[PDB]
Amino acid sequence: SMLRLQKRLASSVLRCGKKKVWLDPNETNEIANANSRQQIRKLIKDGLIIRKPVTVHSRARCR
């Protein structure tokens, strides 16, 4: 339903911003059940939460 808490906790656990937190849009119910940082860690291990990669800023043009 609402996952504002989960995205905040995933950001803290992954040590990234909320930009890079990816919550599986299909498995919303399982993520909604996670109310603890331990539960978020299990979801990160299970692939339901993913740290998205850094947006590419190439220096090939500058080089």
Partner RNA sequence: CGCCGCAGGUGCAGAUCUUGGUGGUAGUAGCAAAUAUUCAAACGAGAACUUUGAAGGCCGAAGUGGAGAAGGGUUCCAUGU
Partner RNA sequence: CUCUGGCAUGUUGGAACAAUGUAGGUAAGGGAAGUCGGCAAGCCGGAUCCGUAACUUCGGGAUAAGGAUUGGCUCUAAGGG
What whole-number distance in Å separates Cα of residue 44 and Cα of residue 31? Answer: 10
What whole-number distance in Å separates Cα of residue 39 and Cα of residue 35? Answer: 7
Footprint on residues 2-61 left by RNA (CB under 7 A): 2-5, 7-8, 11, 16-25, 28, 35, 52, 54-55, 57
At its nearest, how many Å lie between RNA and the CB of residue 47? 13
What whole-number distance in Å separates Cα of residue 21 and Cα of residue 14? Answer: 8
Please give the size of the binding site for RNA, defined by CB under 7 A.
24
Residues in touch with RNA (CB under 7 A): 1-5, 7-8, 11, 16-25, 28, 35, 52, 54-55, 57
